[PDB]
Design a protein around this ligand. Structure first.
Ligand code: HEM
Ligand code: HEM
Ligand code: HEM
Ligand code: HEM
Lengths: 146, 141, 141, 146
């Protein structure tokens, strides 16, 4: 993805502010709750029958952190998402067989979470910029399909 | 399908939105037109800039239709039949676009309602907007 | 929604399919499992090779359910409610997969019915399978 | 897209047999009929209110040919779909604003058309191979979004 000086500015000021201990668990938790099919992949996580179950699951908040870190990487290397994500793409594509549409959905629940955390700070220009990024990560993860 | 919990949830959250529903719509339209430039293809007659009064007036229109759905949640097809004909049968709106709008609506709501946008409400609200979309694309099927 | 023309069309084309419905299903499953490897994730207990009797037996099962829908086309929710619970509520089937299957079904039908797979029937048949899919994912919404 | 010796064999024997005067119009005609939203882009084509209207429209069969030719190119250059499609991607993305999902749909109605033409010859292995290709073309056309 390209990103203009001001889009980068917008993406980078906000990301610095992000609680990288919690947001990453909220996104995954909400992915499971809102799109229950994805739970199939995380049945080892355990007690996930209710939203409060899911949101308090220690392994959910633990794994959401791993996810957030991969996003920080793509942010680090926007110019090379593909090289940045190859090891993950191979995993998600070859091993797990995840339908790439679910990369999009996680991207979008991630955008909601930031909206929810940052409120009016998360203006429409700052959204548009994060949609690009999110779409570039989804596209990169899916590369091994391509 | 919309269980009894979802209905309660959608009713609650829309309630909080109250008189801001129109300001909320106009914002959702703004986030969509910016985030998803491909949707602007349906609005070549609008001025889509930040303060456009056409976007405002259209935001209220979207908000009212949704308010009508919430108020008639057990009879949405009948409630929105006319807006189906329009969207599905005359403007021929690409179905993919209803997802992008519902997404922007959920972002707008998360941006304004930090107490009520819990996981459960988010889930309800997603299902509600998925139903409204199904009815709107209903001609198509 | 399925207009009166579509119904007629679906009834006609299914009619032609007649006693081959089960052989047609098994083929559609085969085209899906090959074309779209990601769907194999739901069938880790099957032998998915060309002659698998499990794929055959499952093809008939898919064909019969569809035959039930056609026969009860003005009451599919009631007709398939149970298969909704299963698909939506217990196996939790990714919705995207219903498109891939419907697509493979349309390819199978085009491959066997060259006289009846006209543009109009193709359109009807696509709408019919979109409805069946909506009912099957109905829990989800 | 990769394609194995035998997948290529399968894709290339069949494509040689293709009536490149007619199939290309059938796909576009059926795209318009089955997914009516796409008609928005072709309102200049004229009389398109019924399927028989659409299927007999001389400009439809004329334009479907242009489309088939672009597919033959990608077939020629599977190893470089991106370079092969750049001028088209820029057109479809920057100029026209076509949602990439409709590239997928045209791909898939193209696969139906070949099934319809070639019948049992269009076995499941030969389908699987054409789905790869079709997906590689869709992915390439959408590149300018990426
Ligand atoms: C936007 C894309 C996403 C990113 C950034 C991403 C990133 C990650 C990361 C970093 C890991 C940790 C792997 C390691 O420890 O080295 C992983 C594993 C995993 N992810 Fe994703 N992921 C994404 C979306 C998804 C989705 C949509 C699902 C499916 C519902 C999924 C399913 C899994 C599963 C089950 C694992 C476990 C793999 C294993 O331990 O064998 N991921 N992902
Ligand atoms: C959640 C679903 C939506 C609702 C509730 C909705 C509601 C409406 C309403 C209330 C009107 C005015 C009705 C009238 O003039 O009689 C309208 C017009 C229109 N909508 Fe939507 N709409 C929705 C989604 C879509 C989407 C996804 C797009 C596509 C980008 C779209 C495109 C249009 C167009 C082009 C018109 C006519 C606009 C104009 O003349 O300015 N709508 N919509
Ligand atoms: C057009 C929609 C479909 C129809 C008509 C259909 C029909 C059926 C039926 C009739 C059964 C057996 C019912 C029983 O045992 O009580 C079944 C089982 C199942 N279906 Fe579907 N199905 C469809 C689509 C899907 C899709 C898209 C997938 C996902 C890849 C899927 C996954 C399953 C699974 C895993 C089971 C249980 C399979 C097993 O135990 O072997 N179905 N389906
Ligand atoms: C699988 C992807 C597709 C391919 C291979 C493709 C290829 C082509 C080709 C070759 C042209 C001719 C351009 C020229 O004369 O240089 C073109 C133009 C066009 N295509 Fe596509 N196309 C595809 C899908 C679509 C879709 C889904 C739509 C939208 C419903 C679309 C809309 C158009 C329109 C309206 C033009 C006219 C552009 C103009 O004359 O300004 N195309 N396409």
């Amino acid at each position: 993805v390209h990103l203009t000086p001001e889009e980068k500015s917008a993406v980078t000021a906000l990301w610095g502010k992000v609680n990288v201990d919690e947001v990453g668990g909220e996104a995954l938790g909400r992915l499971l709750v809102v799109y229950p099919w994805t739970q199939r992949f995380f049945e080892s996580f355990g007690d996930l029958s209710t939203p409060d179950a899911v949101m308090g699951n220690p392994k959910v908040k633990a794994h959401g952190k791993k996810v957030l870190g991969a996003f920080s990487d793509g942010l680090a290397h926007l110019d090379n998402l593909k090289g940045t994500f190859a090891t993950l793409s191979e995993l998600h594509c070859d091993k797990l067989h995840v339908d790439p549409e679910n990369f999009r959905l996680l991207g979008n629940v991630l955008v909601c979470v930031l909206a929810h955390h940052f409120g009016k700070e998360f203006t429409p220009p700052v959204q548009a910029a994060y949609q690009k990024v999110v779409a570039g990560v989804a596209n990169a993860l899916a590369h091994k399909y391509h | 399908v919309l269980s009894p919990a979802d209905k309660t949830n959608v009713k609650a959250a829309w309630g909080k939105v109250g008189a801001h529903a129109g300001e909320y719509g106009a914002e959702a339209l703004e986030r969509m037109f910016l985030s998803f430039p491909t949707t602007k293809t349906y609005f070549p007659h609008f001025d889509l800039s930040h303060g456009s009064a056409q976007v405002k007036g259209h935001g209220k229109k979207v908000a009212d239709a949704l308010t009508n759905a919430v108020a008639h949640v057990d009879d949405m097809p009948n409630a929105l039949s006319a807006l189906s004909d329009l969207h599905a049968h005359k403007l021929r709106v690409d179905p993919v676009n209803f997802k992008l709008l519902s997404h922007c609506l959920l972002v707008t709501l998360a941006a304004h309602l930090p107490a009520e946008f819990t996981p459960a409400v988010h889930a309800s609200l997603d299902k509600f907007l998925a139903s409204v979309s199904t009815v709107l694309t209903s001609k198509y099927r």
